[PDB]
Amino acid sequence: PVFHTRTIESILEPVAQQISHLVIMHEEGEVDGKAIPDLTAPVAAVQAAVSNLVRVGKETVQTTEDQILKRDMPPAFIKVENACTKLVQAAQMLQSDPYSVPARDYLIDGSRGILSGTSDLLLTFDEAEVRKIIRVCKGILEYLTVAEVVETMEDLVTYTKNLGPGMTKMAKMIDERQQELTHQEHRVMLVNSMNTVKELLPVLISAMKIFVTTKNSKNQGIEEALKNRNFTVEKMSAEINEIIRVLQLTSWDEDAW
């Protein structure tokens, strides 16, 4: 199986691979003539865990201001609850008739449903983390649009003192995100893009210092200095937009649950 992040992989494994296997062993049809042992107590443990998960999820629904969580968490609760009802039914059916083929299939379907709803909740939380990172990226893009307004050395010192720490915060968030992505190609793209942006930052500040000097001296170097600053801002902005794009990618190879 291929998951989006190491957090999700750490939770969905080992059961995702177990269910993936069990489905190949019981595609649909299930003619083995074997009995399933009493699942009443193991199923009661799943039901208790599912009810607890829905309770915990509802704490976020009741407190969050993020409307995309209030919208996406409740359908996952319904999926796990309905899937668990199937699992309880299946265990009751199998306790009455351990050799039942139709019940073994409620059982497998209920298990898939629990895994799917749990995966949906985890992806909702993941998507909210990504939105938080993108807000920071967009804030840097916005402050980069202010570079063109800087026409004095005092304003350049102020600009540098605001942008440096902001870029450090963005870099920290990208570093913390990339480290847990499972796709090496995406980690490499994020690390390379963030390094390009970090390397362009002193180039930008230097270009702004040249622009301010040319402005103050009222010399013939202003249009060249301005174009060189704009070129650097354009490249930094293109790179941050590439980060934003990579942060939202889901590879074709990721298993859907």
Binding site: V15, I36, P42, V46, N52, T60, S111, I114, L115
Partner: peptide
């Protein structure tokens, strides 16, 4: 100090894994 969604989800998948280990 309250249980996280991650801890609660791991309880779910552990219990589901333990159940499936019986088939």
């Amino acid at each position: 100090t309250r249980e996280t969604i991650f801890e609660a989800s791991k309880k779910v998948t552990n219990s589901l894994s333990n159940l499936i280990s019986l088939i």
